[PDB]
Amino acid sequence: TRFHSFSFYELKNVTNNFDERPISVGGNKMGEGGFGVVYKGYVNNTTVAVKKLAAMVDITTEELKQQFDQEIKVMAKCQHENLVELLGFSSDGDDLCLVYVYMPNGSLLDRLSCLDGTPPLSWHMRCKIAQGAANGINFLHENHHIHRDIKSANILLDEAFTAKISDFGLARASTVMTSRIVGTTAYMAPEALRGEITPKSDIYSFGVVLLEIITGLPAVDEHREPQLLLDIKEEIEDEEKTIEDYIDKKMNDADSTSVEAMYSVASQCLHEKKNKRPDIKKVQQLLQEMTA
Ligand SMILES: Cn1cc(NC(=O)c2cnn3ccc(N[C@@H]4CCCC[C@@H]4N)nc23)c(C(F)(F)F)n1
């Protein structure tokens, strides 16, 4: 797959000169991460998401360029209904830009937090999102790709709340070790925090996502006990609590049987030993069985 090459000035123009104000006040900024800001745009008779890369954290200009290239490379090779669609990019201008099909319902992270007053996701919608995201990860793993940044902020939701895996800047082709440890701490497997590069780490991070789906709680909350959501697995196992005590109250269609079935998948994904975790095909099978 080869992409459209956009002019920097066309992208600057359709995003109201990269307006960093929220949508609600007439701005174009929809969200931001460590490697960039995503703006709403309208190009070639289509609402788009324009990601302008900028860091914002570490970051070598070459590192950011390597993430820009990595994202285009993964998107050229990987097209799936549970992955975001890249339309094009921009290099000619000062800032590096990535153009995608606009995701009207933004990120799973924001929908779980009901950011800006959006209604809570039903359990029925949550099951479809979990299945869809697992189908997207399966496609990446089948195509020998390791995401390395699986999190609710990197699971986007379309006009039908279909799960779309996004933000492949840190993705790697396929156990190897790295001197540059990258990812989101609260979601990272212990071996990934140590430098290991394995698809087994993506499974662990997906386990954290499944806990966010069941509970509606963020992966990390400094003003909460436990601060890290993954610690709930031990509180439940050590029988101090049950998964029912953690179920998101912002749902009226969640039955205990299917919630326990999703929790069982999350628990298995969150095994501290990488080799004891299920592979993505097993995760898919179990999530499909959950709604059958
Ligand atoms: C209403 N709304 C629409 C979007 N996003 C897109 O439409 C979009 C489409 N493809 N695509 C690809 C990457 C990407 N990355 C962002 C980066 C900031 C942190 C969140 C994401 N991981 N966003 C997108 C957003 C939000 F994600 F920024 F929150 N809100």
Side-chain angles (χ1 to χ4, degrees):
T1 296
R2 279 157 200 271
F3 305 98
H4 192 128
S5 189
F6 287 94
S7 175
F8 172 80
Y9 302 101
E10 186 178 22
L11 307 185
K12 189 182 176 186
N13 198 265
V14 303
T15 58
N16 196 63
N17 300 285
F18 299 109
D19 203 346
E20 271 143 330
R21 271 154 51 218
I23 304 293
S24 46
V25 78
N28 297 63
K29 183 175 149 197
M30 305 199 281
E32 65 178 307
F35 320 122
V37 178
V38 182
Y39 302 93
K40 195 166 177 185
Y42 191 84
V43 81
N44 306 124
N45 314 273
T46 310
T47 312
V48 296
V50 186
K51 183 179 181 186
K52 185 174 102 292
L53 289 112
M56 207 155 256
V57 275
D58 295 27
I59 227 168
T60 306
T61 294
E62 187 213 302
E63 278 174 341
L64 216 60
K65 224 286 176 183
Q66 219 75 305
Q67 287 176 28
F68 174 83
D69 293 324
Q70 193 55 44
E71 180 111 37
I72 301 160
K73 232 194 272 180
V74 170
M75 217 80 80
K77 293 177 177 75
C78 305
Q79 290 107 65
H80 188 270
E81 80 169 59
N82 295 116
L83 298 185
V84 288
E85 190 180 359
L86 185 74
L87 300 169
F89 61 88
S90 180
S91 291
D92 66 300
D94 196 63
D95 299 74
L96 292 157
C97 298
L98 294 158
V99 184
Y100 308 90
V101 170
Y102 168 69
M103 291 286 112
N105 289 307
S107 86
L108 175 62
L109 177 77
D110 297 345
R111 299 292 71 75
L112 286 171
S113 73
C114 300
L115 182 69
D116 298 322
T118 58
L121 296 167
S122 71
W123 182 246
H124 173 73
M125 286 153 101
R126 289 182 209 210
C127 286
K128 183 209 180 187
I129 293 155
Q131 287 163 345
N135 296 348
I137 299 164
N138 179 68
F139 185 78
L140 290 168
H141 289 188
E142 272 184 0
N143 283 246
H144 317 284
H145 284 96
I146 308 156
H147 191 288
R148 298 211 290 159
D149 204 16
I150 292 297
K151 58 184 181 170
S152 57
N154 296 350
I155 303 169
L156 311 183
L157 302 160
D158 76 358
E159 61 178 1
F161 293 87
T162 296
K164 313 266 182 176
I165 311 294
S166 62
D167 304 277
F168 310 98
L170 304 175
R172 289 290 179 90
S174 179
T175 293
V176 190
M177 200 109 109
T178 186
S179 47
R180 292 290 292 163
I181 297 147
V182 291
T184 311
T185 308
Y187 295 89
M188 284 167 81
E191 73 284 354
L193 288 158
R194 281 169 189 136
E196 280 187 38
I197 297 177
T198 163
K200 295 161 183 168
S201 298
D202 281 349
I203 302 306
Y204 185 97
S205 297
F206 187 62
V208 176
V209 171
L210 295 174
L211 291 187
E212 282 183 287
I213 289 170
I214 293 154
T215 72
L217 300 165
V220 63
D221 183 351
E222 55 188 316
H223 312 297
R224 177 189 74 207
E225 196 58 47
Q227 296 194 37
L228 291 164
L229 184 54
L230 56 87
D231 287 330
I232 265 92
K233 183 197 168 166
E234 341 313 320
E235 291 181 310
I236 288 154
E237 276 171 348
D238 298 351
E239 282 157 334
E240 318 171 5
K241 287 178 93 103
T242 49
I243 191 51
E244 208 148 32
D245 306 326
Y246 276 107
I247 305 174
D248 196 342
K249 293 208 142 64
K250 303 187 291 311
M251 303 191 272
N252 75 339
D253 68 321
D255 62 285
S256 294
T257 303
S258 65
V259 169
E260 275 154 27
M262 189 183 290
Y263 177 75
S264 173
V265 180
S267 186
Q268 283 173 75
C269 290
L270 289 165
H271 205 293
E272 290 304 300
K273 302 159 140 272
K274 53 173 180 71
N275 298 329
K276 296 269 184 197
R277 289 170 205 158
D279 61 359
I280 195 59
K281 209 83 206 171
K282 188 62 187 176
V283 172
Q284 260 185 316
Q285 280 175 25
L286 291 164
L287 289 175
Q288 277 160 347
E289 279 165 38
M290 166 186 78
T291 63

